[PDB]
Scaffold this motif. Structure first.
Motif, mmCIF file in Angstrom:
data_model
loop_
_atom_site.group_PDB
_atom_site.id
_atom_site.type_symbol
_atom_site.label_atom_id
_atom_site.label_comp_id
_atom_site.label_asym_id
_atom_site.label_seq_id
_atom_site.Cartn_x
_atom_site.Cartn_y
_atom_site.Cartn_z
ATOM 1 N N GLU A 73 0.904 -1.143 0.000
ATOM 2 C CA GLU A 73 0.000 0.000 0.000
ATOM 3 C C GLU A 73 0.952 1.203 0.000
ATOM 4 O O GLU A 73 1.317 1.722 1.056
ATOM 5 C CB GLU A 73 -0.857 -0.017 1.266
ATOM 6 C CG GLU A 73 -1.889 1.101 1.346
ATOM 7 C CD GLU A 73 -2.816 1.125 0.140
ATOM 8 O OE1 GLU A 73 -3.450 0.085 -0.153
ATOM 9 O OE2 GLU A 73 -2.910 2.185 -0.516
ATOM 10 N N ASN A 74 1.353 1.632 -1.193
ATOM 11 C CA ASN A 74 2.313 2.721 -1.360
ATOM 12 C C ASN A 74 1.871 4.170 -1.195
ATOM 13 O O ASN A 74 0.761 4.551 -1.563
ATOM 14 C CB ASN A 74 2.980 2.627 -2.742
ATOM 15 C CG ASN A 74 3.549 1.256 -3.034
ATOM 16 O OD1 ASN A 74 4.390 0.742 -2.292
ATOM 17 N ND2 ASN A 74 3.101 0.654 -4.129
ATOM 18 N N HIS A 112 1.234 6.418 1.514
ATOM 19 C CA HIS A 112 0.226 6.956 2.421
ATOM 20 C C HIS A 112 0.831 6.788 3.801
ATOM 21 O O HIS A 112 0.176 6.329 4.733
ATOM 22 C CB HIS A 112 -1.084 6.163 2.297
ATOM 23 C CG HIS A 112 -1.822 6.409 1.016
ATOM 24 N ND1 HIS A 112 -2.486 7.589 0.753
ATOM 25 C CD2 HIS A 112 -1.969 5.641 -0.092
ATOM 26 C CE1 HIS A 112 -3.007 7.537 -0.461
ATOM 27 N NE2 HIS A 112 -2.709 6.367 -0.996
HETATM 28 MG MG LIG Z 1 -2.917 5.698 -3.243
#
Ligand SMILES: [Mg+2]
Lengths: 162, 162
Positions: free
Chosen positions: B52-53, B55
């Motif tokens: 999940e890149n 953030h």
């Molecule tokens: Mg995003």
């Protein structure tokens, strides 16, 4: 008294205490980010400012810390504290597994503050997403901390007692 | 003949200092753990962590929160002998915390890129222009303080046989 054996008895119990204390501090960091970082963001002057419902990465961190805690507990080897260690290891897996089970709420970038609190804030009104298990984990580790802390004292009190 | 009365209080005292230092060391380990394992991740039901890149904002908030807690713990350390090594750690601690605030434009939002997060809290990253450099020096300062305090306990424990 036998200053030879008692010396290695102090050194040994102390090493155990330190190991246990490390797990305790790792737990303190999860408590710190739950109480101070949920719904926050770095601010140039006040350090932390408001930033609601994007707690996904923060949860990821918590998770990483929990697996690190599990790792540290599994590394603990001690005859006497064995029963209290397995109790901590058990609650540890329970906590880690609850977070995974709640993947739909915690497994994304836009995790709400409300949900985050239910997962890692042990003093929150509701703890249905992991905070309950975190609370018990603390209790388990604190019990192990008590025992380990006293074994050290007992060993150190042999230098001034029959 | 060794004075088991004073040596005992000498062991009890130096050990308390060690624990206090070790706690800070452990808190530092948690920042390394989240930097190396949680950046660009999210909770996953089966593999624990999944991709999940970009953030990393809430995660950085946590890191910041842990850093101020570390500063808080170091300020609580009082010890004649380790004073100089403690003030060094305190100094580096502020430098690190202040670099994060300074980089608020990059780290002060929910959508913090994995690249920027690594430059702020991953001490082994190729580029360390957003805090990592300072985190590395902080580690060094605390490790030095840890060394000293670890030996003072050893010296006090070696009096029981020398
Ligand atoms: Mg995003």
């Amino acid at each position: 008294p036998n200053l030879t054996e008692i010396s290695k008895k102090i050194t040994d119990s102390n090493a155990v205490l330190l190991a246990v204390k490390e797990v305790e501090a790792l737990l303190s960091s999860i408590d710190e980010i739950a109480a101070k970082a949920i719904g926050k963001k770095i601010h140039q002057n006040n350090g932390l400012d408001t930033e609601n419902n994007h707690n996904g990465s923060l949860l990821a961190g918590a998770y990483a810390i929990s697996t690190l805690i599990k790792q540290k507990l599994d590394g603990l080897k001690n005859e006497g504290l064995k029963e209290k260690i397995d109790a901590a290891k058990k609650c540890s897996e329970t906590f880690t597994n609850k977070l995974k089970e709640k993947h739909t709420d915690l497994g994304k970038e836009g995790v709400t503050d409300a949900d985050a609190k239910e997962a890692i804030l042990k003093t929150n009104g509701t703890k249905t997403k992991g905070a309950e298990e975190l609370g018990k984990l603390f209790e388990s580790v604190e019990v192990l901390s008590k025992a380990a802390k006293e074994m050290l004292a007992n060993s150190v009190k042999e230098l001034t007692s029959p």
